Amino acid sequence: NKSDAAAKQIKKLEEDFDGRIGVFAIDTGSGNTFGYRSDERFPLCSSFKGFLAAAVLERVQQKKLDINQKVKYESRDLEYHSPITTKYKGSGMTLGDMASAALQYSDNGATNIIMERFLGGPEGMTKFMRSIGDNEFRLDRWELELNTAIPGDKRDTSTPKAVANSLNKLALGNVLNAKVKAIYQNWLKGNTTGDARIRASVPADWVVGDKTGSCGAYGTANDYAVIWPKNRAPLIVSIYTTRKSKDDKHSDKTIAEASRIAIQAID
Ligand SMILES: *C(=O)N1C[C@H](NOS(=O)(=O)O)CC[C@H]1C(=O)NNC(=O)[C@@H]1CCCNC1
């Protein structure tokens, strides 16, 4: 009834945007879901960095790593879009601080360093997501190569549904204890890069945690979020987009409106 109209609306949106929109939303109370192109592949871009942080936290909780471990990198020519690591260089950075920088500011120096030293490369990141029962996610390349967003290229992709399921397991399920889960949620709540996406679609009084991606090619951009409405149980929203040609720009507005449509569908 509302699920029907919604599919109608996303389709129109998609035609208006001249591209592909993948949505999966969960209301964790009613168990209700909504899905449009939900098992199609879309590029991850930066969005996997949210899953990266959870992988570090899991190691932390098994006491293979200490969250306060200093990591040195003064000899390293930092990658593009490494805001936090650039302002810490020469002093070391705690493991937890690197992870949260990756997540909340999408810092590519942080991401690469974590994958190189602690997580066993893109293959390691893929291993982690399999371990939580995500069979769709794959990470094949490093920053920044992984942002090529070539249509029909399967490297560095997942599905909207898979992302949403995995986000639910990590932020809401039993992969992390009470303590480390709250840390992970606080990181997600302090993401600085999603104000015009999922965040722009909800009441200001709802708490949102989110992770964005913007490949910068084929107008590919995304956002996934845990939303805490008050007097109601958490929602999961997963919004992925790509466009026809290489030069096409991404659209924040489209993601906000797609988010809004997804949310109404799961009242
Ligand atoms: C991740 O997707 N990133 C890093 C950064 N933060 O993104 S987001 O706010 O989380 O969405 C912004 C861009 C993106 C990334 O680095 N992708 N590629 C580029 O930015 C290249 C720079 C030159 C032209 N586009 C490709």
UniProtKB/Swiss-Prot annotation:
Partially inhibited by the beta-lactamase-blocking agents, clavulanic acid and tazobactam. Not inhibited by EDTA. InterPro entries: Beta-lactam/transpept-like, Beta-lactam_cat, Beta-lactam_class-A. Keywords: Antibiotic resistance, Disulfide bond, Hydrolase, Signal. Disulfide bonds join C45-C215. One of its GO terms (molecular function) is beta-lactamase activity. It catalyses: a beta-lactam + H2O = a substituted beta-amino acid. The keyword Signal applies. Pfam families: Beta-lactamase2. It comes from the Bacteria. Transmembrane segments: none annotated. A beta-lactam binds at S46, K49, S106, N108, T212. The active site is at S46 (nucleophile), E145 (proton acceptor). Its EC number is 3.5.2.6. GO terms for biological process: beta-lactam antibiotic catabolic process; response to antibiotic. It is an enzyme of class 3 (hydrolase). Induction: Up-regulated by the carbapenem, imipenem. Expression probably regulated by upstream promoter elements. The class A beta-lactamase family has a specific amino-acid numbering system, sometimes called Ambler or ABL numbering and often misspelt as Amber. A multiple sequence alignment was used to derive a consensus sequence and then the consensus was numbered taking into account insertions and deletions. This allows use of identical numbers, e.g. for active site residues, despite differences in protein length. UniProt always uses natural numbering of residues, hence there appear to be differences in numbering between this entry and some papers. Belongs to the class-A beta-lactamase family. Class A beta-lactamase which confers resistance to the beta-lactam antibiotics, including penicillins, some cephalosporins and carbapenems, to JM109 strain E.coli. Acts via hydrolysis of the beta-lactam ring. Has penicillin-, cephalosporin- and carbapenem-hydrolyzing activities. This is Beta-lactamase SME-1. It comes from Serratia marcescens.
